[PDB]
Design a protein around this ligand. Structure first.
Ligand SMILES: *[C@@H]1O[C@H](CO)[C@@H](O)[C@H](O)[C@H]1NC(C)=O
Ligand SMILES: *[C@@H]1O[C@H](CO)[C@@H](O)[C@H](O)[C@H]1NC(C)=O
Ligand SMILES: *[C@@H]1O[C@H](CO)[C@@H](O)[C@H](O)[C@H]1NC(C)=O
Ligand SMILES: *[C@@H]1O[C@H](CO)[C@@H](O)[C@H](O)[C@H]1NC(C)=O
Lengths: 50, 99, 37
């Protein structure tokens, strides 16, 4: 994934087959994004004991 | 923080002149415990949300005046021009973006 | 934190100071990793 911002606009690129990404979408916002976060995935059975 | 509206006429157009930028943990309400220690020029305080940080106040002590809370942003961010101390930093609008 | 709204506060481990060591890696753009069309 590429996620960047420029002049009010937000741009997303993605790939699943291969390393270079292709264009997914853009979105006008008018504001500046300042933070991100990756959420914790509360699963049940993915761990080392599983 | 409850910007409700600007009372204007029917066909008034509003324009700004001073735009300010803050961080994303900014709270103008003071701490509700350092107000329980000061006397002179006591501030207004409340509860700030989960992640924000209150306004800092110095505990100043002199020979003419006792323990007083010397906090920032005095008189106002528009006219306080020692502006490395009030968090509302002045900005200028960029292309494509709003104030 | 992330939001400022108390959805649920059951099973909250608020008594800890050990920051989890996250990980590191080195980016290598030599085969095209990091580019786009
Ligand atoms: C999962 O990893 C543990 C770590 O030692 C190992 O003992 C266990 O046999 C592994 N189980 C499977 C199903 O791979
Ligand atoms: C504008 O609205 C406020 C709140 O309703 C009111 O106090 C004020 O008097 C109004 N302005 C005028 C000129 O009436
Ligand atoms: C958060 O909400 C839950 C509702 O289940 C409540 O039990 C808890 O007391 C709330 N936390 C605070 C700090 O009020
Ligand atoms: C943090 O929690 C872990 C287990 O939950 C415990 O082993 C450790 O001693 C804790 N550290 C502190 C500083 O509380």
């Amino acid at each position: 994934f590429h996620f960047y911002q420029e002049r009010g606009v937000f741009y997303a690129y993605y790939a699943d087959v291969g390393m270079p990404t292709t264009f997914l979408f853009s979105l006008y916002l008018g504001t500046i994004l300042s933070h991100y976060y990756v959420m914790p995935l509360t699963c049940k059975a993915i761990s080392s004991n599983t | 923080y409850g910007f409700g509206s600007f009372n204007v006429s029917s066909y008034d157009v509003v324009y700004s002149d001073h735009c300010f930028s803050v961080n994303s943990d900014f709270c103008p309400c003071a701490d509700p415990s350092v107000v329980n220690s000061c006397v002179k020029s006591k501030p207004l305080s409340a509860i700030c949300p989960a992640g924000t940080k209150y306004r800092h106040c110095d505990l100043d002590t002199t020979l003419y005046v006792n323990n007083w809370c010397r906090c920032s942003c005095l008189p106002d961010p528009i006219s306080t021009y020692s502006p490395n101390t009030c968090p509302q930093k002045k900005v200028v609008v960029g292309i494509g973006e709003h104030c | 934190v992330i939001g400022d709204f108390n959805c649920t506060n059951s099973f909250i481990n608020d008594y800890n100071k050990t920051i989890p060591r996250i990980s590191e890696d080195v980016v290598d753009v030599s085969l095209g990793l990091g580019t786009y069309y």
